[PDB]
Amino acid sequence: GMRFVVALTGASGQILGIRLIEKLTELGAEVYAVASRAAKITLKAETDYDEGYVREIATKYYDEDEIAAPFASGSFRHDGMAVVPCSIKTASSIAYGIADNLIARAADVTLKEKRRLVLAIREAPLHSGHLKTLARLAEMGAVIFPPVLSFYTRPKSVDDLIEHTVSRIAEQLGVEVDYRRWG
Amino acid sequence: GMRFVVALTGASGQILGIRLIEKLTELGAEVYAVASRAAKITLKAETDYDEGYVREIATKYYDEDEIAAPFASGSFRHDGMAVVPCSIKTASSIAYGIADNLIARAADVTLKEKRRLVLAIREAPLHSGHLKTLARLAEMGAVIFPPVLSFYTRPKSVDDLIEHTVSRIAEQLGVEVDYRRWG
Amino acid sequence: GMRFVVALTGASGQILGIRLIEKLTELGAEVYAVASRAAKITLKAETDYDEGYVREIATKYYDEDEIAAPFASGSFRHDGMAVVPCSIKTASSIAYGIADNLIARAADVTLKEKRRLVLAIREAPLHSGHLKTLARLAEMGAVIFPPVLSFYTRPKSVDDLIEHTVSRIAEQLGVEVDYRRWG
Amino acid sequence: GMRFVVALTGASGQILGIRLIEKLTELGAEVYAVASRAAKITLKAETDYDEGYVREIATKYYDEDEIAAPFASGSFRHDGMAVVPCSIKTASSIAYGIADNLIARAADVTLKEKRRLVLAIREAPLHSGHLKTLARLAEMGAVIFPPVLSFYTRPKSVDDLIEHTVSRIAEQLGVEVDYRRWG
Amino acid sequence: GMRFVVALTGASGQILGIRLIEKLTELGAEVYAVASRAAKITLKAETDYDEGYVREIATKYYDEDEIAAPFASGSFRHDGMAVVPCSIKTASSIAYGIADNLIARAADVTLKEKRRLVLAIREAPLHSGHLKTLARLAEMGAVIFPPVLSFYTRPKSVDDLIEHTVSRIAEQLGVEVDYRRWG
Amino acid sequence: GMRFVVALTGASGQILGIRLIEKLTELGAEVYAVASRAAKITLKAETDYDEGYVREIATKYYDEDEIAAPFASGSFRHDGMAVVPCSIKTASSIAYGIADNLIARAADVTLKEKRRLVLAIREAPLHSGHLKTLARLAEMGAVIFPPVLSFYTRPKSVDDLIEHTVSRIAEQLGVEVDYRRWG
Amino acid sequence: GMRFVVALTGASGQILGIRLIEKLTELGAEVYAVASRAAKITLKAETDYDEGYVREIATKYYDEDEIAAPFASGSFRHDGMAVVPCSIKTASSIAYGIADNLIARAADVTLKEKRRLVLAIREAPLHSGHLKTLARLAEMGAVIFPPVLSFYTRPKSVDDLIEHTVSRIAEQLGVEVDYRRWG
Amino acid sequence: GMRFVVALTGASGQILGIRLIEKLTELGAEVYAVASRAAKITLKAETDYDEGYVREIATKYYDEDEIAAPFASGSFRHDGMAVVPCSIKTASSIAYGIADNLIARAADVTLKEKRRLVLAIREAPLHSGHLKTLARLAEMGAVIFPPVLSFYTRPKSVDDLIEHTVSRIAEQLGVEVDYRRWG
Amino acid sequence: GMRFVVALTGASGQILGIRLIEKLTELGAEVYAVASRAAKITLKAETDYDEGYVREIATKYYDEDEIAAPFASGSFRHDGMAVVPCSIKTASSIAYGIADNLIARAADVTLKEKRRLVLAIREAPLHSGHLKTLARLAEMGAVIFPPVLSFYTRPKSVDDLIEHTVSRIAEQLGVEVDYRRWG
Ligand SMILES: Cc1cc2c3c(c1C)C(C)(C)CC=[N+]3c1c([nH]c(=O)[nH]c1=O)N2C[C@H](O)[C@H](O)[C@H](O)COP(=O)(O)O
Ligand SMILES: Cc1cc2c3c(c1C)C(C)(C)CC=[N+]3c1c([nH]c(=O)[nH]c1=O)N2C[C@H](O)[C@H](O)[C@H](O)COP(=O)(O)O
Ligand SMILES: Cc1cc2c3c(c1C)C(C)(C)CC=[N+]3c1c([nH]c(=O)[nH]c1=O)N2C[C@H](O)[C@H](O)[C@H](O)COP(=O)(O)O
Ligand SMILES: Cc1cc2c3c(c1C)C(C)(C)CC=[N+]3c1c([nH]c(=O)[nH]c1=O)N2C[C@H](O)[C@H](O)[C@H](O)COP(=O)(O)O
Ligand SMILES: Cc1cc2c3c(c1C)C(C)(C)CC=[N+]3c1c([nH]c(=O)[nH]c1=O)N2C[C@H](O)[C@H](O)[C@H](O)COP(=O)(O)O
Ligand SMILES: Cc1cc2c3c(c1C)C(C)(C)CC=[N+]3c1c([nH]c(=O)[nH]c1=O)N2C[C@H](O)[C@H](O)[C@H](O)COP(=O)(O)O
Ligand SMILES: Cc1cc2c3c(c1C)C(C)(C)CC=[N+]3c1c([nH]c(=O)[nH]c1=O)N2C[C@H](O)[C@H](O)[C@H](O)COP(=O)(O)O
Ligand SMILES: Cc1cc2c3c(c1C)C(C)(C)CC=[N+]3c1c([nH]c(=O)[nH]c1=O)N2C[C@H](O)[C@H](O)[C@H](O)COP(=O)(O)O
Ligand SMILES: Cc1cc2c3c(c1C)C(C)(C)CC=[N+]3c1c([nH]c(=O)[nH]c1=O)N2C[C@H](O)[C@H](O)[C@H](O)COP(=O)(O)O
Secondary structure: OOEEEEEEOOOOOHHHHHHHHHHHHHOOOEEEEEEOHHHHHHHHHHOOOOOOHHHHHOOEEEEOOOOOOHHHOOOOOOOOEEEEEEOHHHHHHHHHOOOOOHHHHHHHHHHHOOOOEEEEEOOOOEOHHHHHHHHHHHHHOOEEOOOEOOOOOOOOOHHHHHHHHHHHHHHHOOOOOOOOOOO | OOEEEEEEOOOOOHHHHHHHHHHHHHOOOEEEEEEOHHHHHHHHHHOOOOOOHHHHHOOEEEEOOOOOOHHHOOOOOOOOEEEEEEOHHHHHHHHHOOOOOHHHHHHHHHHHOOOOEEEEEOOOOEOHHHHHHHHHHHHHOOEEOOOEOOOOOOOOOHHHHHHHHHHHHHHHOOOOOOOOOOO | OOEEEEEEOOOOOHHHHHHHHHHHHHOOOEEEEEEOHHHHHHHHHHOOOOOOHHHHHOOEEEEOOOOOOHHHOOOOOOOOEEEEEEOHHHHHHHHHOOOOOHHHHHHHHHHHOOOOEEEEEOOOOOOHHHHHHHHHHHHHOOEEOOOOOOOOOOOOOHHHHHHHHHHHHHHHOOOOOOOOOOO | OOEEEEEEOOOOOHHHHHHHHHHHHHOOOEEEEEEOHHHHHHHHHHOOOOOOHHHHHOOEEEEOOOOOOHHHOOOOOOOOEEEEEEOHHHHHHHHHOOOOOHHHHHHHHHHHOOOOEEEEEOOOOEOHHHHHHHHHHHHHOOEEOOOEOOOOOOOOOHHHHHHHHHHHHHHHOOOOOOOOOOO | OOEEEEEEOOOOOHHHHHHHHHHHHHOOOEEEEEEOHHHHHHHHHHOOOOOOHHHHHOOEEEEOOOOOOHHHOOOOOOOOEEEEEEOHHHHHHHHHOOOOOHHHHHHHHHHHOOOOEEEEEOOOOEOHHHHHHHHHHHHHOOEEOOOEOOOOOOOOOHHHHHHHHHHHHHHHOOOOOOOOOOO | OOEEEEEEOOOOOHHHHHHHHHHHHHOOOEEEEEEOHHHHHHHHHHOOOOOOHHHHHOOEEEEOOOOOOHHHOOOOOOOOEEEEEEOHHHHHHHHHOOOOOHHHHHHHHHHHOOOOEEEEEOOOOEOHHHHHHHHHHHHHOOEEOOOEOOOOOOOOOHHHHHHHHHHHHHHHOOOOOOOOOOO | OOEEEEEEOOOOOHHHHHHHHHHHHHOOOEEEEEEOHHHHHHHHHHOOOOOOHHHHHOOEEEEOOOOOOHHHOOOOOOOOEEEEEEOHHHHHHHHHOOOOOHHHHHHHHHHHOOOOEEEEEOOOOEOHHHHHHHHHHHHHOOEEOOOEOOOOOOOOOHHHHHHHHHHHHHHHOOOOOOOOOOO | OOEEEEEEOOOOOHHHHHHHHHHHHHOOOEEEEEEOHHHHHHHHHHOOOOOOHHHHHOOEEEEOOOOOOHHHOOOOOOOOEEEEEEOHHHHHHHHHOOOOOHHHHHHHHHHHOOOOEEEEEOOOOEOHHHHHHHHHHHHHOOEEOOOEOOOOOOOOOHHHHHHHHHHHHHHHOOOOOOOOOOO | OOEEEEEEOOOOOHHHHHHHHHHHHHOOOEEEEEEOHHHHHHHHHHOOOOOOHHHHHOOEEEEOOOOOOHHHOOOOOOOOEEEEEEOHHHHHHHHHOOOOOHHHHHHHHHHHOOOOEEEEEOOOOEOHHHHHHHHHHHHHOOEEOOOEOOOOOOOOOHHHHHHHHHHHHHHHOOOOOOOOOOO
């Protein structure tokens, strides 16, 4: 019984976090989901998905102000956290300890207990301040995963690209996943 | 009359560099194109595009061993260079001065003459060694542009995503471009 | 048609940002204005200016929670941003990527697209943590402009000092301005 | 007449800040107290203390949003500030200048005026990002005081341990205190 | 059959290392114990525990001068090492390679073979030299665990606090432990 | 079924990589082997081993120009990579991202996916540039293993020394191995 | 009997390396010469010198792929190495250990054995990446000698300038040379 | 109407600054010239040029003690500054803010207003202290241009070499210049 | 008459230091020998050599507590020092100035007087803390010589390998030695 935290933050690519939650659920893991306010605004602008769809597919759902949620403490056990998509604001809050909501605090707790943390950073260009922040995060142990376009799987629709990226992110959580791979 | 260097290297996303060459050509700029050996191998694996298609659409074409090409010198004038897609190997060669082919040397010449250089870095995850390299490149003046998935334009096919990313890369070259933007 | 973002934050010197908006408007530029909550509190404590005066003189006005404003995306074009006056909190939020309101996000977008950003940092003393933060911002490309007393123009009232400083800040935005200068 | 700021933040150990306020009050100093929202949530979870008990024992009480409180300016005189207990979020906000509430701003003002600041950092483990943050704070002049278990005083109850730690923290404020010490 | 090294050094909190040895023994692991000279002096000052009690409860006991003990070589297999409590002197000896007794050498061997090392650093305040040392240790892979007071488990005696801290340290060794946790 | 990449590069000690391949094969793992051009030149100068012996004992063999080999992508799964012996050129290519052949690219892919990478660096003296490079590699997660003479196993021939070193390198891959160890 | 390695690389100023070889030969030293492929291309573009002239005047000549040449090992004795002219690519390959041809490997061997290495770096402008590379090389012990125009010797032809620069480079090899000097 | 500051300092190569002033004057720009005391001493030792020749060809001339000259203030507008030739002393004074004469102050003013500054650094060898200084200057935005010998234009006299170098320096000022270039 | 200090410390490879003493004695130099306590323990475990054999073959012998030995002062002249084999503990003591015995103090005196110091560091793996320590030592001027296996001399017994390594270490002391070398 593996349990994972998945957080959606206010960057483009809300569909990536929704699909990661669906895949991890499919594979029989529990997912504790958190969506920030900005992620809900982006979901509205970006998709037609029901505003309560994330709460629907998650094992348990928390809003970003639920700072007393169970995984706000390192004494609560789980197997890893993914922030997908991850804004610069959340990546930077984690990097520098500005743990002022449940998402940043849960990620900080993941890092201090040396559990796996995967950040699907979505921003471009990245300036030297961003890059130093990501380097600091990498030093702290986080997996830095820009959700880059990939074509070696020969994708034909947007869902093809989403599936490849979501699969590759799941592997960063230490998950055996079935998907097209390079041969 | 604006002239730009566009280099394709051995990362996934060959279509991005092809389409950037087409767009810049459409807008009436000259494009001096270079494709590395690994980029030609990737083009073959990734697309069905004619092996000589890049040479076709470019104003002038060079192979990566043409180390005496005109823009290998800073005394030759041009308005900027883009490496799309950019492998870790080429980004790192530029960062550390291992200018052992035309692509890395042309980018180094672009940087030392303080012209615009845009690197469409495609790799994920990025480890701390990659991130320090990109930070060094940013300090040298390069634009670091991971070709990240974007959805706020509400894309419906793969060509939609390619067009947004290619447009955003063109803007990093100081180019006025017409495309859907955030409102 | 040049467009500029001007943000007021919670430091003393609200009059400096008001007057910069008036000058840029005088010269025929559009100004997109943002005032933080703390800046509105300071305006009340510091001036007798109408609480809606900034909205009056601006081309378009946004509150700091309007995180979906047009210049929250790099695909929206403008010619530069000034934060006048700039608190330590906002300068530091920009430096470290804590882009949790429209002001910090707009400034981050200005920086990543290599547009001009001018920060009228008002704090004294500056401790070593402040100075490292400002050095980081300078490395990212921001103009660091403490609004220092100046006397070589032989000022005779408070408005004289404000005019010199506002003029010098406008020049950091790449603006031709008419004012008394050193001969 | 010595005056001290004491701030409680959202880490375990609310009793430590309550008892420091009582001791400083006992010794005839004035205490200006601030409790963050998260500290009030923790107090509720951790103790049975009256929700208004801190306001009761303090000379003057402020909530964390009272950003215009007197010690938000360096022109207001006081003799030092202690944050007890201090969360990672508040320590990091101080370190990097994210002075977005009264607690972080008051501590920043304490530091820039070279007054004494004592941070009772309570977190374990501390990862390399935390440690770099604390090192930065130490460079800025803050006293870093993890509220560690101590046994050389031969404590027999929880109140014994609290008294030793609160006494040692008071000494970091430059306070003569009477307590059991090593001989 | 899991085997762990537990070292006691000359900081207050000898009871923490004794209790960790008891817990790991309870759970059926072997414990190879080492106590430094200063730890024996502190045990005498701090407790009433028999001077040979550590040797009693350990699977095998070594004094700090037994520099040829089996785990002084990386070719000897074990599952992790904890130094509880850890003095500044021992943490710093490990950080900088001054491996002049069995404790520092065993910890260095743990680190170079990328096994788990947990350091229950007990000192307060920590000055900037201490913090840089701990940051270096964190970079080398050590878990830095100040044995901080914790109250969210609502402890009622000194043994309550010791049990929480010892449990949390055991978890840093990768040990499944049964104890009260945050909900 | 565990699979490992083993690469031979152009440093003295070709026998070490041959014997590691034999041991891993003996223990029932698959080995994907790569030998650089310089390693083949060194093999000829150093041994009498058949030029195709490495291809013989490997599960699958690749030359260093086979940049499209399966483990050039992180989507291909394996359990670790060893470069034995490792030249300064290959260690430095990995450190700085100059991933211009299959060996450096495979090692970079191993690192970015946080798999185990062991580098049997053979050079002496090591100057400060080498040492900074190895420190960077260590930060990226690589195991740095100079193949140093060892005598505590009381070796009597050259094969004794090779067996100890090859065994110790195998352990860095997370392999249970049977060999003489310190007692 | 003093022996020196002189390498020509692909920067302008091939005449400088030819003349250094002639001078050292004149003074009765042996010169082991290496010319890279790019240096041969530059010689053709830059001079009318016979393509085999360098091999003619050298004691022994090697091409850059002769990676098994005697001075590829530190056990081979010589008195110093000069790279004249030195490209950014070769200087950077030496700095970062990318010793992928005889020139970079011979220079690395010179450095690790603490012999004299003189690099006649010819590039302008030098960007911050170049300057950090040269600083690293200087730390490793290399002499950094940009072949700058000099006029205090009152030169009257191009050969006058070449003679001054070649003489000054020879002195960096620890060679007594007769030439016009400042008085 | 473009205006440029050109400063001559006490390094060999006075002819380079004289010729740059002539070229910029030829092209119809105004040149504000400054010569240091050491540059006048070098001019005397190096050339036969009239001691007042620089004042003759300049639009306006200043001695280095004219610290109140117009471009000692950022409020005075100009289009860039070149120091040709630039001594280590002047480059270092600019780098570290020792702005104790008009040349260093004018260059500092050029940098703080983000105008173009080109430093024709003439010294060889450059030790690690020089290289760190130049790297700092590059970070501040200065163009670092060692006046290196160049031969790809196939120069035949000293004036040929001077013309190439002066032309290349003019291009660093953002000047369209007509000269032989690489093809 | 050349005099050299040779120190044996508590790492495997005692035979290397014995043989270096024999070779230097053979060549007619004086050797002042020091063996640490741990080196004597290792000699016993590792060899059958007489416990007083080192004292026998040395010109003069000192134990590590003879802190007043002649070469504990820089005013005593000698030609270099080798620590063979060198433990991490001794290398680190030298690096950081923990000069608490004759070996570390003699090496520190060697370094401050800019005499040659060669450290035959024997440890593997080397973690990032070790590598930073060795880099610091290299910066201080020490020769870092891991006693790596070497095969290009085509060794046939253990004594063959020892002779090559001892010869190469002697060369780092500036000693002309006769041994098989690369051709
Ligand atoms: C409303 C909004 C916010 C964007 C945004 C967009 C919009 C509409 C888009 C979709 C229009 C284009 C881009 N966005 C990104 C972005 N931040 C970021 O780092 N990456 C992004 O891709 N932001 C900023 C982000 O939402 C703010 O920085 C929030 O404070 C982030 O807070 P959070 O991490 O807690 O969700
Ligand atoms: C053949 C090949 C090379 C991939 C590659 C792929 C293949 C088939 C894919 C498409 C299968 C999956 C990924 N690839 C990337 C990659 N390098 C990189 O940094 N990003 C990539 O996305 N590489 C490595 C790259 O081609 C080598 O590092 C080259 O030496 C790069 O040289 P270049 O910059 O001169 O083109
Ligand atoms: C209410 C308030 C806030 C002052 C302040 C004052 C008051 C009354 C004064 C006018 C009384 C004296 C000084 N002030 C400054 C200050 N922050 C700063 O860096 N520089 C200042 O000059 N602050 C702090 C500031 O408003 C808080 O740090 C906000 O969180 C800043 O948030 P903002 O950047 O989003 O506006
Ligand atoms: C609700 C809550 C928050 C804990 C917390 C706990 C709970 C219930 C406990 C008591 C259950 C276990 C641990 N806690 C700590 C913690 N932050 C920290 O650095 N140290 C802590 O000891 N946090 C996080 C903290 O409250 C958030 O990071 C706040 O944003 C801090 O904001 P503040 O500094 O303004 O109070
Ligand atoms: C005797 C003694 C030593 C204390 C000490 C105390 C005493 C009596 C107390 C209990 C009275 C109060 C504090 N102590 C600590 C301390 N070192 C440290 O970093 N943390 C401590 O908590 N020390 C110092 C320590 O014992 C010396 O630094 C030893 O050299 C440590 O050596 P070790 O790591 O090998 O045991
Ligand atoms: C031919 C050759 C190359 C030696 C070498 C030798 C020879 C004959 C010896 C065996 C004679 C003595 C030493 N060697 C080493 C060496 N590089 C290194 O870092 N460590 C070595 O031990 N090199 C250099 C190496 O082969 C070149 O640097 C290659 O470019 C390395 O490329 P590779 O990593 O792709 O194999
Ligand atoms: C063909 C060629 C290459 C120039 C060059 C020129 C040409 C024609 C000139 C003569 C036209 C103008 C300038 N050049 C220089 C240059 N590299 C450099 O750092 N400094 C130079 O002065 N290069 C680049 C160089 O040759 C490539 O970077 C090679 O990969 C260097 O490889 P090498 O060090 O092994 O010779
Ligand atoms: C008199 C004098 C000064 C030389 C000099 C020469 C002479 C005669 C030469 C022409 C004989 C050979 C070299 N010179 C250089 C030099 N400084 C430097 O960095 N590069 C040089 O090329 N100097 C030093 C320089 O003039 C002093 O450092 C001044 O203080 C520089 O001050 P300035 O920048 O204000 O002019
Ligand atoms: C007893 C002993 C100590 C080994 C050791 C061995 C044994 C038996 C072996 C031979 C069994 C395996 C490895 N050893 C090494 C080692 N230290 C080190 O850095 N490299 C080594 O190769 N050590 C540690 C060393 O002796 C201690 O760190 C001493 O404090 C070093 O002190 P010294 O430098 O003053 O001699």
